Design a protein around this ligand. Structure first.
Ligand SMILES: CCC(CC)NC(=O)c1ccnc2[nH]c(O)nc12
Length: 167
């Protein structure tokens, strides 16, 4: 038993809710919150911008030190950093950004990072401003992640569509 509340169960291991991931993280304090990162860990908008804002920019400060030491992530890759006031840890995962022309097949590789964590609160990778089809992203999630994932979908209209179209 865990503390996530109000989720619809999609599969054995995937759950979904119409929620603001920032508010969900602050209430749940999950072990892992996933950020929809880019390779530079520049948290300017979308989920990243909102998570970073909720940390009072501490996420960005930590991220800039990470990049200065290690260089950029790979598309499809990830790193574990602090969760600040939102979670124990933040798993920064880089899904392909369709608005940059990145290969959508890398979306499966991105979701594979979730398998290194038993339970995660996460957004749909490559959705929103990353330009992928969220229905496709949900399908890849379900077909790739084997650990327990709680998906927060900010847009109620999208949440209902994802549920109604789920196979
Ligand atoms: C998954 C990408 C997209 C789908 C609507 N979400 C956002 O761009 C976003 C922006 C700001 N705050 C948020 N909180 C949350 O859960 N998602 C967001």
């Amino acid at each position: 038993v865990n503390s996530f509340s109000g989720y619809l169960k999609l599969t054995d291991n995937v759950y979904i809710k119409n929620a603001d991931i920032v508010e969900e993280a602050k209430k749940v304090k999950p072990t892992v919150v996933v950020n929809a990162a880019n390779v530079y860990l520049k948290h300017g908008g979308g989920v990243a911008g909102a998570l970073n804002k909720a940390t009072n920019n501490a996420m960005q400060v930590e991220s800039d030190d990470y990049i200065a030491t290690n260089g950029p992530l790979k598309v499809g890759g990830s790193c574990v950093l602090s969760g600040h006031n939102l979670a124990k840890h933040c798993l920064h995962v880089v899904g392909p950004n369709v608005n940059k022309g990145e290969d959508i097949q890398l979306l499966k590789s991105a979701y594979e990072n979730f398998n290194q964590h038993e339970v995660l609160l996460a957004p749909l990778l490559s959705a929103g401003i990353f330009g992928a089809d969220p229905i496709h992203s949900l399908r890849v999630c379900v077909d790739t992640v084997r650990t327990n994932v709680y998906l927060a979908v900010f847009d109620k209209n999208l949440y209902d569509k994802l549920v109604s179209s789920f196979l």
